[PDB]
Structure formats: structure tokens, C-alpha cells
Design a protein around this nucleic acid. Structure first.
Ligand SMILES: [Mg+2]
Ligand SMILES: [Mg+2]
Ligand SMILES: [Mg+2]
Ligand SMILES: [Mg+2]
Ligand SMILES: [Mg+2]
Ligand SMILES: [Mg+2]
Ligand SMILES: [Mg+2]
Ligand SMILES: [Mg+2]
Ligand SMILES: [Mg+2]
Ligand SMILES: [Mg+2]
Ligand SMILES: [Mg+2]
Ligand SMILES: [Mg+2]
Ligand SMILES: [Mg+2]
Ligand SMILES: [Mg+2]
Ligand SMILES: [Mg+2]
Ligand SMILES: [Mg+2]
Ligand SMILES: [Mg+2]
Ligand SMILES: [Mg+2]
Ligand SMILES: [Mg+2]
Ligand SMILES: [Mg+2]
Ligand SMILES: [Mg+2]
Ligand SMILES: [Mg+2]
Ligand SMILES: [Mg+2]
Ligand SMILES: [Mg+2]
Ligand SMILES: [Mg+2]
Ligand SMILES: [Mg+2]
Ligand SMILES: [Mg+2]
Ligand SMILES: [Mg+2]
Ligand SMILES: [Mg+2]
Ligand SMILES: [Mg+2]
Ligand SMILES: [Mg+2]
Ligand SMILES: [Mg+2]
Ligand SMILES: [Mg+2]
Ligand SMILES: [Mg+2]
Ligand SMILES: [Mg+2]
Ligand SMILES: [Mg+2]
Ligand SMILES: [Mg+2]
Ligand SMILES: [Mg+2]
Ligand SMILES: [Mg+2]
Ligand SMILES: [Mg+2]
Ligand SMILES: [Mg+2]
Ligand SMILES: [Mg+2]
Ligand SMILES: [Mg+2]
Ligand SMILES: [Mg+2]
Ligand SMILES: [Mg+2]
Ligand SMILES: [Zn+2]
Lengths: 138, 208, 104, 99, 124, 83
RNA sequence: GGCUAAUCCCCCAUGUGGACCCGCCCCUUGGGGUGUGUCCAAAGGGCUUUGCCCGCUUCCGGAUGGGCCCGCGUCCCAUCAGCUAGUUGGUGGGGUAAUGGCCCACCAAGGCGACGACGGGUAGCCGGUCUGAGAGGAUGGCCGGCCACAGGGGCACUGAGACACGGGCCCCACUCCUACGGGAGGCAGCAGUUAGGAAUCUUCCGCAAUGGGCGCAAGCCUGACGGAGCGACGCCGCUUGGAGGAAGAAGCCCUUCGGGGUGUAAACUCCUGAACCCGGGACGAAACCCCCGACGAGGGGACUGACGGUACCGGGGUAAUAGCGCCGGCCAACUCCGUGCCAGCAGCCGCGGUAAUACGGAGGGCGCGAGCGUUACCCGGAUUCACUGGGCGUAAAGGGCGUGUAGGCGGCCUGGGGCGUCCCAUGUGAAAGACCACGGCUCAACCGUGGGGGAGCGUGGGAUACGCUCAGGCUAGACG
RNA sequence: GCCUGGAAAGU
RNA sequence: UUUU
């Protein structure tokens, strides 16, 4: 069974990005969508859309990269470097606004799901309401 | 009893000038003036590339070896600076300068720091009026540092304070050579001093 | 104010009393994971009213006996073994795991 | 040695006795009060239940029985009296009870 | 380990074993002597070191080592243990305090003096 | 019987009390109910005796007898003056 | 055996009131009100004695202190896995201030345990304290809170309160008196002794201050406390001198026998002047009391300091303690001689068998300084028990394999509940400590004043994304 | 004493 | 044989 989808989705991404793929499907789930939504907004991905495969709902996720470098290994820089799951099943992690983290001394983001909704840290800090950390990303 | 002994020598061990004797350490005799090689037999022989530590240690001494203070006292001051606001390394200096014994020298009532220190344990100095015989005393900003209305008429003092006539004094300081008066204006900010030292090492030295 | 707990009625034998299993739940002090954990309270039921396997509210109360400081506030939900079962079985798991072993 | 305030002990026993006294009195009566109701002698049972009552409150006055201790005694007694007195009878002199 | 496992067993701490059962843990232990044998070094060392067997106050019979050039330790003298291993002689984990009781500190010792307990020589 | 007394807090040859409300049976410097002032026997500072009264008046309003010294200071701040 | 007073004990009265039984009403475990019945009070003393004072009696309430109960939290071993008969619950009863197998008679056959019962080990708990970047680890000494003990054990009396450190009774162990029958004891109060040990102080001064008991007060008691004394045991301040002074005495050391070193160090010149002496000399202490006003408010006056002839102020005034560790690398500081796997060093790696910067001595040099080294113990470094923050093909580490119990984990959609989770308000989180600012002692250590923070926990209200639960639905997992 | 770098043995 |  799919132990933890989210972990799974972030992984699917973590993976495809490394091989430098263009798109990358993922089993559809509101929440999963809600996450992506932020990724898109924060500018980590060329966005994404709903699709169908075998007849079941997936989420084409269009990946984003840098520009060809020079010299050895002309592989682009990953728009998305780091990107890990935090609160996994059997080890849920919860923070109260006062506890939300400084993802990458500023340059990163942290996706919290809150009673107000899924949202970036600063977003949270803004509405002032912590919740469940979901994934240091940067 | 802070050190006490072959001094114009530490000038030598540090390979630079600290001016411990005030005068003389100015004429053609501070030894560094022809004989800059440190003390001991192995003084003139070729030097060996020093260890990062080596340096660290040498620097702390140099600076602490100037104000002639105990590693103990010295340490507590730095530890105090660490604990405070502002570029710690600097602040340390501030505290260091506020040592009255220093100030009485900064205002040249005495030839050097040593001699200055003595004019204090002997009550010749004052702050806001009341007498004070504590070198370690820390002059606040706005205190007047004069001489003993009684002790004023001293050779050593007249001699020194007189030779201070028309002499320029530190910017964070000022004085009136007339009545032996003086005054602490502001904590000399890093730039104000010309200490031959990279105190940013004294910082490093106290870590390891 | 007087504490209040909820749980099922795992034991009935005692006359005028009921064992009330009360599952607590929380975050591990050091490792995080919310470990579930529990405790059995003997509620004082004066009319042998409540039956086995009924969720109830338990109220903190002035002593009825040694090992008995609670009265049954009210009935939350009626009937529902399973919970009792899980309980009865665990009591069974204990079987002989000492010289021979439990059973399965 | 000699810590002159041994007097307290000295005093202590002197009291112990005055106390022990008052109680024993209350008990023997209390018991008595019962056998009378127990059997059935109402007017008589009451009469004593009464003395008993007094004897008690009396004790309550000093550092003897004191407090609700007095009170318990009373209730516990006026209790059964009225009880065993239930198997016929009826407050013949309605001593201390009411109805 | 999984957290769940960590929750079930946690982490075993670590009982650090002593290395000087002078017992009572105290700084020093008083003793008396027995032997005053000599001992052969091990590994790549050769010599003869002043060793001593000692019946302690802690009801122990450990072997203590004697430092310094020469000594005066009898065979019924009250020495003082201070514990200190000795690479060369496996088995000797404690040193003596040359300078107390019947230790009569080393004689004619100029340098390291406080160690070897010897009062300061006068310069007439 | 609760009282209003003084509690030692200075150092050697250095005193400093606290005008405090406690229960007679406590140590002198032990746990009290409420601090309600402090007294400096040597007026080392331009201020050697604060007290407050709305409070003092309170404990007085209920038991809490005060040490004679307590009262002395305690009064010097007009805890009683009702002209 | 006899006499006798009282605020000692008792009976009768008055009953604001209050206690108890029965009934009733409001409340809701035994709270509040009410009716009949019953039951229950008291102490007197003083003077400025015809009114004031200290005091007594009964009831309601305030304040302070305390008992009992419950949720959560609190070390090691599973080479401790089953434990239990007052044991678990019931009814009646005893008992207490009061709930309760607290104790009893009877009836029931329960109660606890792997979420670790039971057994063994070890241990007062906490505020805090040391360490740490933090998370943590270690610790619980001084000071403050609670607990427990008073030669060992058991018991209760008297009291508002005790099962009572300087009260009582018995059994025990030990010491002393003993006319041998029977008795007297109990420093874990201050000080002091002896033993044990590596190790731990004066048979001190005083009640003046703070606090406490009794007393109307005067006052008495107060080894509590306030001070002194001995110990560098710790922390902080200070002295052993300042300025000058040869291209450089001597002695010691090294040498390419030119010289180089100790060294501006000394000698010596001049200045200041710790010690030590002489005079003055303290705050801490103004209340209780007394007089005026009424013994209130307010005012006046008097008495009273152990530390002390001390601190501090002025005068005079002498150049007047320096020691300890290390110098192969880690680690800052090198040369001669002695010695030859010896004597020895040593934290680790290691040095010594004839040129040793590692042994010992001297010169010199580094470090620190009335201190410096050593031993021991704790945290650190050590992501070396890894939650933050680790691993398991060959380095230590995958169970010989499966089946499956408990447990952990659990796909997509909608709605409800709101346990988890998050937000607001409020209560709590004593003082001291810690942190910041300011202030008092000449500085500091020390102290004072004020401020800010604080996890967790309770109450009220809210949010519903995620987790949980209930209810419906789906087919991509699984199964047929 | 001899030899070995120096030892142990051997001489 | 042992040791640099
Ligand atoms: Mg008496
Ligand atoms: Mg060797
Ligand atoms: Mg040595
Ligand atoms: Mg008679
Ligand atoms: Mg009476
Ligand atoms: Mg009457
Ligand atoms: Mg113990
Ligand atoms: Mg760490
Ligand atoms: Mg006992
Ligand atoms: Mg009493
Ligand atoms: Mg009693
Ligand atoms: Mg007791
Ligand atoms: Mg005693
Ligand atoms: Mg004693
Ligand atoms: Mg001894
Ligand atoms: Mg008094
Ligand atoms: Mg004292
Ligand atoms: Mg000089
Ligand atoms: Mg005064
Ligand atoms: Mg008096
Ligand atoms: Mg007056
Ligand atoms: Mg070096
Ligand atoms: Mg040699
Ligand atoms: Mg060495
Ligand atoms: Mg040497
Ligand atoms: Mg010192
Ligand atoms: Mg660690
Ligand atoms: Mg280890
Ligand atoms: Mg881990
Ligand atoms: Mg590893
Ligand atoms: Mg292997
Ligand atoms: Mg295998
Ligand atoms: Mg294997
Ligand atoms: Mg789910
Ligand atoms: Mg589940
Ligand atoms: Mg909730
Ligand atoms: Mg709070
Ligand atoms: Mg506090
Ligand atoms: Mg404070
Ligand atoms: Mg100040
Ligand atoms: Mg809702
Ligand atoms: Mg379903
Ligand atoms: Mg040989
Ligand atoms: Mg071989
Ligand atoms: Mg060898
Ligand atoms: Zn110089």
C-alpha cells in the first residue's frame, strides 16, 4: 500500500528533477493539489494540471530548472534543490506559530497545513497560526 | 602584584613596542632600538614558523601585557565584554580604557601606567572630589579626575603635569592643565586607539 | 474542577461497581510520536445500571472505598464490545508467556 | 536534670482521669438507652436517652468529647433509639425525639 | 531504529567503570606495606622499578608504585596512595605520595619539587 | 496569628529588611504571605522606607498584628494618620 | 490520713444562639432555610472603682495554618513474570475533625500485571546548581518549600494542634550508681571530646538589632539570631615599589675564544610611601515606656549598642613576601654537562643500550602569581546510545525460514463530531537565583531597588487543513 | 673479558 | 633469539 502519498509526491518530484524530466505524473488528491498550489506560487514549478491515465486522475507536474552551465557537466541548476518531508505517519510534527522555522535563513519555505489551511511559513506567521509542518523545501 | 620586573624586555619578547617605562622607552634606549631580538640565549637565532595558537597567545599577551593586568582580571573583563552588546572585541577595549589607572596616565599625570598605578594606591588622585585608590576602578563617562588638593604640590606631579602644558590629549578625553583637573568624555571607540594589536585574535584565543 | 473521564466498562462482576477502561492519548515527551496509553478506573454504579461495553463519563468523587474514587456521570454511547474484546484478549495474550508462552 | 515543667505530665494524668470518667459515663448510659428500646420500654428508654444526650453535650463543653464528636454520639444514639423503638411503642414521653 | 522502537526500548545510557577503586572514591587512601619487591617492565622497556604491596584502609591489598630516584620505604611503613597507572608494569594502578607519613620525599631534588614532596632548599 | 514584621536581607554588617506579612510561626526570613515594603536602617539611599498602604491597611483590616518596630516604620508612612 | 483558695471540677437558671432525631422547602453527595421535641453557656482580676481595662461564655463570618482525595509527572535490573485474602466489591457497624478494608461481623469472588504488576538494587523530593550552541547530561551542598527521623521497635495520654528531639509507658542494645532488691540515662540544639577518615572550626561575645514565648506593663527567657574567632576552602579588591640608569660590572651559563646571554635587571640618584605610631571616632537605634491630646490620630521627652576604641577622617612615616608548574608532539617555551634499555619519566603516542631539546642538574625561556601543581568526581569534546543527531554486503550489527497474536502504520470523495493539533483571553508558575537597568559599600566580590521573560497545568471562547472517530460513497491496494 | 649497534645465549 |  502507499504508506504516505505526500512523502511519495515530494519524492516523485525529488526524483524526476534529478534526471531533469519535463513533466511527472502523481496520483491525484485534494491535499496533494493544495501543496503543489504553493510550490507553484512560490515559483518552484512550471505549475501543474489534472490528467487521466488508465482512466484514473493524476497531476502532471511541470518541473522548472536553471540554464545550461559551462565547462564540465552542462546540466542546469535545479530550481528545486532541497525538499524533504517532515511530519511523517508515525511521527507527526506540530508547531505553534511561535515555533515555525526559518527555512534556509530566509531563502526557503516550509509548508504548514493549518486549521486556516495549507500555507507557507511566513504566510502562517502572517495569519499567526501554526499547525503541522509538512516539508522543509528549498 | 602585577608582574614587576624586566619590562623593556617584554617589549623584546613581543618583538614590538609597548612603552612600559613611559619616558626613556622614547629615547635611543628602549632596546627595541638596536637589539629587537627577544631575550635569552636562543634570542638571536633564527625563528621557527609559529603555530596558529602561537600567534593567538602572543597577541593576547601583547595587549594584556600593556595595561599590566592579571590573566585573572583580564579574563573576567573579556568575559564581561562577551556577555554585553556591541562588537564584543571593541567593548573589551572600552572597559580596558576605563580603568582609572589608565586614565590617570591617559591624562599624563604620570610618565607611564605603572607609575600611574602608584599615584593611585597612594591617594594622589580623585574622581568627582572623593579620593580613590583603586586602579581597577572604572571611570564612568562624565567624571572629573584631578589631583589631591594637598598632593598637587608634588615634584613628580608638577614636573609631569607641567610638561603636559600645551600637549594634545585623546579625543575621548580632555583636561585643564591649570588646576590639575581633567575629564572622561566618552569610551574611546576602537578607532580612537592605536594599539599595535589585532584584538580580534584575543577573541579567538578565548575559545579553542 | 472535578475531573471527568470517558471509557468503556470492561468489568462487571463486582457488585455496585464497574471497571472503566479509559484510554488517554498524547505526544511522546522526547520522541514525538503520539503514543496512546490507558488506565482502569473503578466507577461507582449504585443501581448496577450500566452494563458491559458502554462508553461512559466518569466523574472525580469523594471516596467510596480503597481503590475506588469515581462515580458514573452518565452513559455516553451504549453497547460496543470490540473495545471490550481488545481488552479481554490482551488479558489473554498474557496466557502463559512465562514458562511456555502466550497463545495465538 | 529536673526540667520543672514535668508538671504538665503531672497535670496530664490528673486530666486523663477526669476525661476517662465522663466518657465511661456516657457509654454505659448509651448502651442502657438501647436495651430499653431494644426490649420496648419506651417512656423509660427515652428518659435515659435524654440523660445520655445531656451527659454528652456536657462533655462537649470542655476539652473532652468536643465538637461534632459530641454531635455524632448524639445522632448515632437518637438514631437507633428511634429505630429499635420501632416494633411497637410510640414516644410515650416523646423525650428528645419529635414527630 | 524506528521511532516506535525508540519509544519501546529507548537508548541505553552508559555506566562508566572506575579505574581507581581506592574505594570511597576519595582522593587518597592510606595504607601500610608488605612487599617492596622490584618489577620488570613490559613492552619495549627494561629496568627495575620500586613497587610495593599495600594493605589499605579500605580493606584492600593493592600494589602501589614508588616514584623518584631513591626511597626509604620500610616493610611496615605507612604510605599514601594516590592512584596513577603505569604503562610498563601491568597491575600497578596506584602511586605513592612521596612526602607524607613514611614516604620521606626524594632527596636532593631541584626541578619538579612539589611532586616528590621536598621543602625548599635555602640559599645562604 | 498573622503578623506584619521585618525580614533580614542585607549582608554581614549590612541589613535590609522587608516589611512583610507572615504567620508568626514562620522562620524570620522564611516564606511569607505578601511583601508590603522594605526598610533600610542606614538610609544609604535617598530612599530608605517605602511602604504602600492600601495593602498595609488591608492586613491591618484583618488580624496581622505588627512588630513594634514594624508599626514604628509602618506608621511613619502614615499607615494610621487619618487627619 | 487531715486541712484549704482559685479564672480548678460539678449541679440548677437565662438560650441571642447552637447541637441531634422526624417532617417540609430551596438547592443538589453530608449545602442553605424551617416547624414541634430534646439537649448545651460563662470567671473572674485590675486600678485614676461607680467605668475604664485585661479576661470569660454561646453563635455567624474574616484571616492564617493544616488533614483527606484525584489527573499527570518522578532512577536501575525482566539473569525479578505472574501477584493478592482484608485480597477487590457489597450491606450493617466501629472509629475520626472528616471521606475510606482505616478496623470488625456477615455476603459476593473479585482486584492488579508486559503501557511491566510482584521481587531485587539504589535514593529524601523540589526551587535550583554545574555543564552544554541547544536538546540534553550530571547533581540536590549553602539559602528557601515539603517529607521523614530523634539509641532500635511498638503504644497512647494531654492538648486547637503531637503520637510529641530537650513529655510519658513497655520490649531491646549499651553506659553509670547499686545496701544486688531496684534504679538513672539518650548532642541528628551550640560548643567540645573520642573513634573512623585523605578531610571538616571556638567548651567564644552579646540581646544592642531582627524574630519568638509569657506578661497590661516594667521585664524575664531566647547557643534563633546579630557579631567575633580558627582554615588561602572559594570568590573579589590590594602590596612586594615608582622614574632614571653602559651599546652595557661582577658571578653563573653558552662560545665558530671575536663574542653572545642573564640586563635596565642590579649597584647607585632622586619621588611616592604599605606596614607601624599619635589624635578624633560611626551608622547601625528608635520604638516599647512616659507626658500632652481620650491609653486613637498627631506632638514631646528619656533609656538603650555585642561587633568597637572596629570601620572611617586628619597627622607622622620605613623600599618593605615570591613562589609553583612546564620547555619531544598534542602545547607557548633550547642550549651544556652528568648518565648509558641503568637510574629514571610517563596523560596518550613513547624516551633511555655513549652527540638524549623526553631521565637528573645548571643556564636560559614559557605560563600563572599568594598562589601553583597533583588525585578524585561531574558535564564537555563524544552525531562515542545519534529526539535534534548514527548505523547493520565486506568494518561490530538481519533474526535459519514461515505463520500469525498484541502493537505500530493505513488509498480516493462528501458530511457530522472537535480527542489530537493551532489561536485569543484569563488563572497559576512564592521568595531567592538567573537576565537587563539603576542605586549603596572608595572599586569589586556582596547587597538593594524596579523591570522583562517563562514550559506545563486549569477555565472560558474560537478554528477544522492534517491525524482520530462516526456515517455514506468510490475502485487505482488487497482478495475472489 | 670476547662479539654485537646494544643485549640474551654461546663462550 | 630479544630491541632500535
Ligand atoms: Mg507552668
Ligand atoms: Mg625503552
Ligand atoms: Mg618531570
Ligand atoms: Mg486524703
Ligand atoms: Mg472552667
Ligand atoms: Mg442547664
Ligand atoms: Mg539513604
Ligand atoms: Mg553536544
Ligand atoms: Mg525511636
Ligand atoms: Mg492549648
Ligand atoms: Mg483529645
Ligand atoms: Mg512525629
Ligand atoms: Mg538532646
Ligand atoms: Mg555538637
Ligand atoms: Mg584517625
Ligand atoms: Mg524582642
Ligand atoms: Mg550565627
Ligand atoms: Mg627600575
Ligand atoms: Mg539613628
Ligand atoms: Mg527595652
Ligand atoms: Mg507617639
Ligand atoms: Mg612549541
Ligand atoms: Mg648525553
Ligand atoms: Mg616532557
Ligand atoms: Mg631535564
Ligand atoms: Mg586573590
Ligand atoms: Mg552525547
Ligand atoms: Mg565510550
Ligand atoms: Mg536518530
Ligand atoms: Mg557508527
Ligand atoms: Mg561482520
Ligand atoms: Mg536472512
Ligand atoms: Mg547471522
Ligand atoms: Mg487516512
Ligand atoms: Mg488505527
Ligand atoms: Mg480540541
Ligand atoms: Mg500560561
Ligand atoms: Mg522567582
Ligand atoms: Mg530581584
Ligand atoms: Mg556604584
Ligand atoms: Mg465544524
Ligand atoms: Mg468507508
Ligand atoms: Mg653492557
Ligand atoms: Mg623472531
Ligand atoms: Mg628494546
Ligand atoms: Zn621599552
Amino acid at each position: 500500500m502507499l504508506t504516505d502519498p505526500i512523502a511519495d509526491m515530494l519524492t516523485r518530484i525529488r526524483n524526476a528533477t534529478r534526471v531533469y524530466k519535463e513533466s511527472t505524473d502523481v496520483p491525484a488528491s485534494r491535499f496533494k493539489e493544495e501543496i503543489l498550489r504553493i510550490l507553484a506560487r512560490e515559483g518552484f514549478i512550471k505549475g501543474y494540471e489534472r490528467v487521466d491515465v488508465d482512466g484514473k486522475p493524476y497531476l502532471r507536474v511541470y518541473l522548472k530548472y536553471g540554464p545550461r552551465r559551462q565547462g564540465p557537466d552542462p546540466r542546469p541548476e535545479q530550481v528545486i534543490h532541497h525538499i524533504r518531508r517532515i511530519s511523517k505517519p508515525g511521527r507527526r510534527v506540530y508547531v505553534g506559530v511561535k515555533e515555525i522555522p526559518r527555512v534556509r535563513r530566509g531563502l526557503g519555505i516550509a509548508i504548514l497545513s493549518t486549521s486556516k489551511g495549507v500555507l507557507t511559513d511566513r504566510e502562517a506567521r502572517k495569519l499567526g497560526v501554526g499547525g503541522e509542518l509538512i516539508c522543509e523545501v528549498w | 602584584g602585577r608582574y614587576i620586573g624586566p619590562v623593556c624586555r617584554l617589549c623584546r619578547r613581543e618583538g614590538v613596542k609597548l612603552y612600559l617605562k613611559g619616558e626613556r622607552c622614547y629615547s635611543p634606549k628602549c632596546a627595541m632600538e638596536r637589539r629587537p631580538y627577544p631575550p635569552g640565549q636562543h634570542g638571536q637565532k633564527r625563528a621557527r614558523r609559529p603555530s596558529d595558537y602561537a600567534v593567538r597567545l602572543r597577541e593576547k599577551q601583547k595587549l594584556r601585557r600593556i595595561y599590566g593586568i592579571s590573566e585573572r582580571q583580564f579574563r573576567n573583563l573579556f568575559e564581561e565584554a562577551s556577555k554585553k552588546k556591541g562588537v564584543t572585541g571593541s567593548v573589551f577595549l572600552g572597559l580596558l580604557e576605563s580603568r582609572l589607572d589608565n586614565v590617570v596616565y591617559r591624562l599624563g599625570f604620570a610618565v607611564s601606567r605603572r607609575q600611574a598605578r602608584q599615584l593611585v594606591r597612594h591617594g594622589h588622585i580623585t574622581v568627582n572630589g572623593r579620593r580613590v585608590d583603586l586602579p581597577s576602578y572604572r571611570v564612568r563617562p562624565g567624571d572629573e579626575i584631578a589631583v589631591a588638593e594637598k598632593s598637587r604640590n608634588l615634584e613628580l606631579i608638577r614636573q609631569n603635569l607641567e610638561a603636559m602644558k600645551g600637549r594634545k590629549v585623546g579625543p575621548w578625553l580632555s583636561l585643564d592643565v591649570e588646576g590639575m583637573k581633567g575629564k572622561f568624555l566618552r569610551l574611546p571607540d576602537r578607532e580612537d586607539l592605536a594599539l599595535p594589536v589585532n584584538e580580534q585574535l584575543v577573541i579567538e584565543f578565548y575559545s579553542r | 474542577p472535578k475531573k471527568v473521564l470517558t471509557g468503556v466498562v470492561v468489568s462487571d462482576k463486582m457488585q455496585k461497581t464497574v471497571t472503566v477502561l479509559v484510554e488517554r492519548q498524547f505526544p511522546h515527551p522526547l520522541y514525538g510520536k503520539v503514543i496512546k496509553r490507558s488506565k482502569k478506573y473503578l466507577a461507582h454504579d449504585p443501581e448496577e445500571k450500566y452494563k458491559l461495553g458502554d462508553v461512559v463519563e466518569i466523574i472525580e468523587s469523594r471516596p467510596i472505598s480503597k481503590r475506588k474514587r469515581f462515580r458514573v456521570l452518565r452513559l455516553v454511547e451504549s453497547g460496543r464490545m470490540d473495545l471490550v474484546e481488545k481488552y479481554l484478549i490482551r488479558r489473554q495474550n498474557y496466557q502463559s508467556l512465562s514458562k511456555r508462552g502466550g497463545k495465538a | 536534670r529536673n526540667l520543672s515543667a514535668l508538671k504538665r505530665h503531672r497535670q496530664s494524668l490528673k486530666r486523663r482521669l477526669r476525661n476517662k470518667a465522663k466518657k465511661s459515663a456516657i457509654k454505659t448510659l448509651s448502651k442502657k438507652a438501647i436495651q430499653l428500646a431494644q426490649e420496648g420500654k419506651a417512656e423509660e428508654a427515652l428518659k435515659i436517652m435524654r440523660k445520655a444526650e445531656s451527659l454528652i453535650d456536657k462533655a462537649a463543653k470542655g476539652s473532652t468529647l468536643h465538637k461534632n464528636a459530641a454531635a455524632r454520639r448524639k445522632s448515632r444514639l437518637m438514631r437507633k433509639v428511634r429505630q429499635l423503638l420501632e416494633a411497637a411503642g410510640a414516644p410515650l414521653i416523646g423525650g428528645g425525639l419529635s414527630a | 531504529p524506528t521511532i516506535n522502537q525508540l519509544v519501546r526500548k529507548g537508548r541505553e545510557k552508559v555506566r562508566k567503570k572506575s579505574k581507581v577503586p581506592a574505594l570511597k572514591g576519595a582522593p587518597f587512601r592510606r595504607g601500610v606495606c608488605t612487599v617492596v619487591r622490584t618489577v620488570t617492565p613490559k613492552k619495549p622497556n627494561s629496568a627495575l622499578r620500586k613497587v610495593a604491596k599495600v594493605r589499605l584502609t579500605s580493606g584492600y591489598e593493592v600494589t602501589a608504585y614508588i616514584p623518584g630516584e631513591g626511597h626509604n620505604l620500610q616493610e611496615h611503613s605507612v604510605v599514601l596512595i594516590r592512584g596513577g597507572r603505569v604503562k610498563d608494569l601491568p597491575g600497578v594502578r596506584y602511586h605513592i605520595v612521596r612526602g607524607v607519613y613514611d614516604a620521606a620525599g626524594v632527596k636532593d631534588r631541584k626541578k619538579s619539587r612539589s611532586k616528590y614532596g621536598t621543602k625548599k632548599p635555602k640559599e645562604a | 496569628m498573622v503578623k506584619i514584621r521585618l525580614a533580614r536581607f542585607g549582608s554581614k554588617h549590612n541589613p535590609h529588611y522587608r516589611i512583610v506579612v507572615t504567620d508568626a510561626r514562620r522562620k524570620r526570613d522564611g516564606k511569607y504571605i505578601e511583601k508590603i515594603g522594605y526598610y533600610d536602617p542606614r538610609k544609604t539611599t535617598p530612599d530608605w522606607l517605602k511602604v504602600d498602604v492600601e495593602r498595609a491597611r488591608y492586613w491591618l483590616s484583618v488580624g496581622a498584628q505588627p512588630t513594634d518596630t514594624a508599626r514604628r516604620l509602618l506608621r511613619q508612612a502614615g499607615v494610621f494618620r487619618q487627619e
